A paper describes a structure:
[name]-M-14 belongs to the extended spectrum β-lactamases (ESBLs) that play an important role in emerging multi-antibiotic resistance mechanisms. We then looked at the first 5000 frames collected in the first run. At 25 Hz (maximum frame rate of the PILATUS 6M) this corresponds to a data collection time of 200 s. From these 5000 images, 5109 crystals could be indexed with CrystFEL and data collection statistics show that with these 5109 indexed crystals, a full dataset to about 1.55 Å resolution can be obtained. This means that less than 3.5 min of data collection time is needed to obtain a full serial crystallography dataset to near-atomic resolution using monochromatic X-rays at a synchrotron. For these 5109 indexed crystals, a total of no more than 34 µg of protein in roughly 3.3 µl of microcrystalline suspension was used. This corresponds to only 6.65 ng of protein consumed per indexable detector frame. In comparison, 6250 ng per detector frame was used in the first [name] experiment and 89 ng per detector frame for the lysozyme mix-and-diffuse study, a drastic reduction in sample consumption. Again, the refinement statistics and the resulting electron density maps are of excellent quality. The datasets collected here allowed us to determine the first non-cryogenic structure of inhibitor-free [name]-M-14. Like in the EuXFEL structure, two N-terminal residues that could be built in the cryogenic structure (E25 and T26) could not be built in all three RT-[name] structures due to the absence of interpretable electron density.
Serial crystallography at conventional synchrotron light sources ([name]) offers the possibility to routinely collect data at room temperature using micrometre-sized crystals of biological macromolecules. We show here the versatility of this setup and methodology by performing structural studies at room temperature (RT) of three additional enzyme systems of biological relevance: (i) [name] [name]-M-14 β-lactamase, a β-lactamase relevant to multi-antibiotic resistance mechanisms; (ii) Nectria haematococca xylanase GH11, a highly active xylanase suitable for industrial applications; and (iii) Aspergillus flavus urate oxidase (UOX) in the presence of the long-lived intermediate-like 5-per­oxy-9-methyl-isourate (5PMUA).
Author numbering: 27 to 57, 59 to 238, 240 to 288
Amino acid sequence: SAVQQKLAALEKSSGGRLGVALIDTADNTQVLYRGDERFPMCSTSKVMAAAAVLKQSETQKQLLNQPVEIKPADLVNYNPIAEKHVNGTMTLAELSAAALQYSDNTAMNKLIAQLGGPGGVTAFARAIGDETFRLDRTEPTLNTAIPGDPRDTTTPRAMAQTLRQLTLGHALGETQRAQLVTWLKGNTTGAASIRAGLPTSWTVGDKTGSGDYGTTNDIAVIWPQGRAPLVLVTYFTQPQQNAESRRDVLASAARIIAEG
């Protein structure tokens, strides 16, 4: 496969380890590169926590409007939105939007708490048929991305299938799914990642992640004009703990995929 040789070449040029899964919902064909290797999720895990809260709201129909206190002690390392509301409240919807669209880490920790800890996020993954995802820690320590460490990892294949079911499938109810899609389409952190390798005409919803070891990730749902949507996951990590982020690799991987 030409796409697999070009992805292997991109990886060699980059000096890191690249993982890719594409699902084409037209024929449900899959393109995988290191699809069964584990990669640190970093903030791409926020999608699962938000979806788990949405699933709870199918029965607790007013759950997303519940106010949650933001206190100074709740603040961690990166809280662009929560900081604007310390000693006030945010609703669970506002926290979900902040975690997804601004990668707010305090918001992620509040979602984890609502689910009863990391094990409650993992439980949701299992409930929708994802046996691979594991969330072990809260923010910010889930981003340590230590080589070989299985904590807070998943595989590209697994995350593609799960993102498909959440956004285009029916793992969530109809209003919950629509809300997730709307949040993802509204992400503000993704301009330099998958979006940058795709035609400007295509609609993307995505969630970025970054961490130590130069870990640079993006998971996306893509709606090409007049064509079936695609799911694309791109994970990348590097050998030096201090390595710089490489969002250009993810753009390049998307461009390779789009060429095919």
